[PDB]
Design a protein that fits this description.
Chain lengths: 153, 48, 153
């Protein structure tokens, strides 16, 4: 997570994180800023606005060292920068008070060091905080899970 | 006037067609609603 | 069960129980009374009269902390506020004598903490008492299982 996750800056303040997954760079659209890495500054970022994202093709050198996505999602606990995130009923949550603005784009890590989702926003719900994110699927289908009251971080 | 004016054969077939269309619309609609209710009940019973 | 199950008041007496499952709150129709919770009093209830139930969308600060649902029902003993309930021959039964009026809407829990059925009434056969409840199916169909002679509690 530390090596292959680059913050996006704006006026000296971090407002998101960009992720290189499966040989391609991805960044979320709701955040505006400057990508940290110089080599990836030259990638023309094709935008999926309804997916609230832009994606680009990383150069030759860095396509070998990237994070790996996953399709199988055994329900339970998954790794993340701010601890363990909980998955049941096709839904991701975290203990309340964990996470906030500027954490968008941080991948969710699993046991074998692979990505299972990308955090986009969260809704504080008292007992927990429900994470509005994007996830994969068995048939290679990317699906949003944005619960009610979701706020783009 | 050598012939009495009745009610049945006193309105043109254009007026008759428009009136019958406007009334048969409601009749067919209530029939379709009853059919939909019966089908929903039968589906509930079968898949119960 | 004690924390997430609430009493319904009828002139100041207990007459039922309202259950929160999966972010939705259900309550039997035949039992008339006011929900003790002030927040739930403002929740609009839409009624399945033929199922003798009303369900509503719970507020934002209780939906996660809810009785998780399940559909797998092997025969045997299952949890209950008054003890153990026997699920045999596709029928829920209890020892004859325990349970009665005011126990409608009582959730039946699983060993792992999930809900299997909600009690609506009971009929005494003399040897045991068969509970008219609502049971769930593999295809996501909720059948109101009512043995002959069932009386809503």
């Amino acid at each position: 997570e530390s090596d292959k996750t680059f913050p996006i800056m704006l006026n000296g303040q971090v407002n998101g994180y960009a992720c290189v997954v499966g040989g391609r760079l991805m960044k979320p659209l709701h955040v505006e800023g400057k990508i940290d890495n110089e080599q990836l500054a030259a990638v023309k970022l094709k935008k999926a606005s309804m997916y609230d994202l832009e994606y680009g093709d990383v150069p030759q050198n860095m396509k070998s060292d990237t994070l790996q996505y996953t399709s199988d999602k055994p329900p339970g606990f998954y790794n993340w920068h701010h601890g363990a995130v909980q998955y049941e009923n096709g839904r991701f949550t975290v203990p309340r008070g964990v996470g906030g603005k500027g954490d968008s784009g941080r991948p969710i890590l699993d046991n074998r060091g692979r990505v299972v989702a990308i955090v986009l926003g969260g809704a504080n719900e008292g007992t927990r905080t429900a994470l509005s994110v994007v996830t994969w699927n068995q048939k290679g289908v990317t699906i949003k899970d944005t619960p009610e009251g979701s706020e783009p971080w | 006037h050598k012939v009495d004016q009745e009610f049945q054969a006193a309105v043109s077939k254009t007026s008759w067609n428009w009136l019958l269309a406007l009334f048969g619309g409601a009749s067919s609609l209530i029939v379709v609603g009853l059919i939909v209710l019966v089908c929903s009940s039968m589906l509930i019973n079968t898949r119960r």
